[PDB]
């Protein structure tokens with residue numbers, strides 16, 4: 001595991017995730033230094049960070065943030081690779097010149113990242129543009145597995161005991177209504193992430209309470225098509241927002257439509 005001495009931290013906080021506060025740092029490997037991002041813990045919580053690390057340790061995919069390791073000194077610390085460009089929603093906010101086909105590339109990468117996660121039977125549970133990190137303008141990685149769960153070999157959903165404070169605007173009806181989280185409910189979140197991407201990092205359901213969003217969806221109402229969003233991408237959003245879980249597509253089908261659409265547009 002990781003040694004505090006070989007870890008240097010800058011003291012400005014880059015932002016906050018589910019169980020901590022992310023800071024830039026430098027970690028000396030054998031010969032070189034790796035620039036890193038370090039989630040630092042604010043009773044239970046230690047277990048939560050450790051659990052997140054336990055999830056990350058089992059994941060190896062090009063489109064998922066790699067964990068370097070864990071560090072236990074002064075605070076409990078989860079050491080990750082640094083995605084220099086930061087979160088997708090902030091980047092697109094500040095980079096309105098980013099081309100529609102650039103955004104397709106990036107959301108397609110998230111869908112590859114998520115297809116892997118679906119094949120691996122892990123549920124993300126907090127998929128949102130804020131937790132997509134940009135290594136480069138054409139390379140996105142999924143992060144923050146603080147809410148993630150390893151599914152049982154006999155089940156395709158995790159059932160939460162209660163509702164703790166949740167990112168309700170990214171949650172499918174069955175998560176809100178029944179606390180049932182599956183890869184299919186990550187697909188719902190992905191659609192909201194797509195809406196975020198093609199709206200250049202604008203928040204979904206602006207000015208509405210979680211309760212008003214739920215009520216809007218149960219009417220069969222959905223968010224509109226963002227300015228300049230290609231119609232095939234907006235169609236996929238609505239598919240992701242299928243109310244019935246069973247009819248909603250899985251990430252294999254979502255990634256396939258993203259892949260064909262992206263490859264079609266050269």
Ligand SMILES: Cn1ncc2cc(Nc3nc(N4CCC(O)CC4)nc4c3C(=O)N=CC4)ccc21
Pocket residue numbers: 014015016017022037065080081082083084085086087090130131133143144
């Ligand atoms: C310009 N900017 N603004 C924020 C920002 C953050 C990265 N920071 C990163 N930031 C976070 N968080 C802060 C922002 C929140 O939206 C999500 C939690 N997590 C990670 C990194 C990271 O590089 N690697 C693994 C995990 C790098 C650049 C950033």
